[PDB]
Design a binder for this molecule. Structure first.
Ligand SMILES: Nc1ccc2c(Cl)cccc2n1
Lengths: 156, 39
């Protein structure tokens, strides 16, 4: 089916009506989403089928038709844009300066923006429009608000 | 059977809605990929 670069909605008809379970990025003929969105299930695009190629429950990441392609990183300084894609609603850039996840294994960029769980997989951009990671895996803070990692995969 | 629909290009949009804070958070990550507040 449709292989054009850009951002896509991830839908099911297994519930009432058509329900948006998450979001993803097509780049270099590979589709990139978060594991908790598809659970490593195959996807349809027109009459076409997308089969999983790579995934890791711990990174919460998964690629379709080829290896992970997105190798851009937050510089740890500049602001970024969440290209958010919410259920029922049009794509919308939201600009922010990321905070930090401090972990035993390292520091990770984090974006404090709160959106329905169906927005999981929406990409995050540097000033050159390169994808530096995916929104939708993180944590609930004191206030009850949501804070997501900038989740990025490794390219070969 | 889940399916995909295109929703836009991936572009930096000059003069987009500039919001959200920048919190520094102590977190752990389990074998299941779920994040947690280390306190
Ligand atoms: N309150 C919540 C709970 C879970 C969320 C997920 Cl998984 C993704 C994005 C936002 C979220 N907001």
């Amino acid at each position: 089916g449709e292989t054009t670069d850009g951002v896509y909605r991830v839908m099911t008809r297994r519930l009432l009506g058509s329900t948006q379970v998450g979001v993803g990025v097509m780049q270099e003929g590979v589709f990139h989403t978060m594991w908790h969105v598809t659970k490593g299930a195959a996807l349809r695009s027109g009459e076409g089928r997308l089969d999983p190629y790579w995934g890791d429950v711990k990174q919460d990441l998964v690629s379709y038709c080829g290896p992970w392609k997105l190798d851009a990183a937050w510089d740890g300084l500049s602001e970024v844009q969440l290209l958010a894609v919410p259920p029922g609603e049009r794509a919308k850039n939201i600009q922010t300066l990321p905070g930090i996840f401090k972990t035993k294994d390292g520091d990770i960029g984090a974006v404090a923006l709160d959106y329905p769980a169906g927005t999981s997989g929406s990409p995050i951009l540097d000033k050159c429009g390169r994808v530096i990671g995916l929104y939708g895996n993180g944590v609930v803070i004191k206030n009850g608000s949501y804070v997501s990692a900038i989740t990025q995969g490794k390219r070969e | 059977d889940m399916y995909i629909e295109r929703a836009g290009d991936i572009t930096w949009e000059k003069d987009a809605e500039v919001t959200g804070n920048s919190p520094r958070l102590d977190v752990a990550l389990d074998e299941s990929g779920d994040f947690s507040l280390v306190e």
